[PDB]
Amino acid sequence: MAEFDAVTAFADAPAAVLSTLNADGAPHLVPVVFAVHVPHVEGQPARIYTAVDAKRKTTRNLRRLANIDRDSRVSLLVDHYSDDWTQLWWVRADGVATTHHSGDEVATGYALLRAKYHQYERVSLDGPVISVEVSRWASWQA
Amino acid sequence: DAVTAFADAPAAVLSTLNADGAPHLVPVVFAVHVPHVEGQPARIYTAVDAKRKTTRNLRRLANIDRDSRVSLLVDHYSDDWTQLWWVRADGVATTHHSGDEVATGYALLRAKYHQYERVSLDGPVISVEVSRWASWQA
Ligand SMILES: C[C@H](OP(=O)(O)OC[C@@H](O)[C@@H](O)[C@@H](O)Cn1c2nc(=O)[nH]c(=O)c-2cc2ccc(O)cc21)C(=O)N[C@@H](CCC(=O)N[C@@H](CCC(=O)O)C(=O)O)C(=O)O
Numbered sequence: 431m432a433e434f435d436a437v438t439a440f441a442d443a444p445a446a447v448l449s450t451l452n453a454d455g456a457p458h459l460v461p462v463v464f465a466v467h468v469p470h471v472e473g474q475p476a477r478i479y480t481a482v483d484a485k486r487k488t489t490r491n492l493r494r495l496a497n498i499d500r501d502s503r504v505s506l507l508v509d510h511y512s513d514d515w516t517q518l519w520w521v522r523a524d525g526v527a528t529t530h531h532s533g534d535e536v537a538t539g540y541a542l543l544r545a546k547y548h549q550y551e552r553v554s555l556d557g558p559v560i561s562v563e564v565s566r567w568a569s570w571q572a
Numbered sequence: 573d574a575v576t577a578f579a580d581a582p583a584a585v586l587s588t589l590n591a592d593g594a595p596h597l598v599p600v601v602f603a604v605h606v607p608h609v610e611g612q613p614a615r616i617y618t619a620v621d622a623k624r625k626t627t628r629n630l631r632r633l634a635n636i637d638r639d640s641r642v643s644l645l646v647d648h649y650s651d652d653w654t655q656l657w658w659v660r661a662d663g664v665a666t667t668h669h670s671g672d673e674v675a676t677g678y679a680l681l682r683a684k685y686h687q688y689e690r691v692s693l694d695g696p697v698i699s700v701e702v703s704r705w706a707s708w709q710a
């Protein structure tokens with residue numbers, strides 16, 4: 431951990447990269463917007479929420495190629511890049527992802543995303559929510 | 573042109589596998605060489621440079637030496653969500669502690685980043701041969 435508040439810096443950033451494992455164990459990367467929920471009690475883990483944008487579809491037809499549901503281990507990285515290399519920093523969060531189609535976690539993820547991103551005033555939230563339980567934080571600065 | 577967009581971007585995220593199989597992520601500056609040779613994969617180079625670090629024996633190198641399979645992502649983010657795009661390169665990485673690929677990587681890095689003009693590079697270079705490209709734009 432570098433000497434800044436890594437969780438706040440990660441939380442305040444608008445975009446992160448999400449890494450999941452393919453079926454054959456190879457890495458896979460997608461960008462995400464997200465919102466961090468900081469623990470209520472000391473010792474409890476942070477959780478990170480991201481929603482998947484969904485078009486209206488049949489309940490059991492369309493399929494997703496990549497797997498979280500098969501392997502749940504994920505990592506998320508926020509980088510602050512600048513052409514001025516003195517201003518570089520990053521924060522990584524490693525954890526376990528769970529996909530939710532209804533229930534508390536969907537409601538919580540939509541609410542937190544709406545609170546963070548003004549854009550969701552005009553972009554609907556209709557898809558499933560991935561919740562990541564963070565087990566390790568790392569950070570670095572220039 | 574996904575490949576050119578990726579190549580021109582200043583930074584990417586690199587994913588490697590830890591010993592236990594779990595994903596590891598670190599940001600990188602990089603340079604892409606597309607050979608002008610039919611069937612040759614694109615090659616991405618990144619180095620262990622002078623940005624502050626405690627060791628040159630970084631975790632991502634140990635990972636690559638264990639399991640060569642990597643992915644790298646360029647994201648183009650904007651507050652205007654109409655301007656979003658990303659490009660992902662999946663491939664096979666090799667670490668180089670000496671030899672031709674070290675000099676090739678340093679040279680391509682310097683050609684792209686003015687910031688490296690006056691930096692002495694002497695850490696290892698990773699080269700990645702891309703097996704697949706993927707892309708999306710808003
Ligand atoms: C021990 C070591 O830590 P360190 O000396 O603090 O490493 C700091 C480097 O990651 C740091 O110099 C680079 O990220 C800087 N850096 C670049 N550094 C470069 O050398 N080359 C680049 O192209 C580069 C680009 C870049 C762009 C954006 C940015 O924000 C930073 C960038 C290490 O192994 N680092 C890892 C990342 C941290 C890590 O994984 N640590 C372990 C714990 C340490 C251990 O394994 O015991 C963990 O969290 O599991 C690595 O770089 O692969």
Ligand code: NA
Binds near residue numbers: 467
């Ligand atoms: Na709370």
